[PDB]
Amino acid sequence: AYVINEACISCGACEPECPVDAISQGGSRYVIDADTCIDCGACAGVCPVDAPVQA
């Protein structure tokens, strides 16, 4: 699983780019469903602040 850390500015650009639709808008920051994420790294590639990190 990847996890979106506190650098997230909630721009929303990663949500459409997740191939398995694991990302959604949350309170404060976007969130990854760890039971769906397959570690492709696509969300970090479109993140301007590089908030998604592999855990």
Ligand code: SF4
């Ligand atoms: S690493 Fe890939 S599967 Fe996981 S949330 Fe990011 S884009 Fe989706």
Ligand code: SF4
């Ligand atoms: S692209 Fe990055 S800054 Fe924008 S919502 Fe996703 S994790 Fe947050």
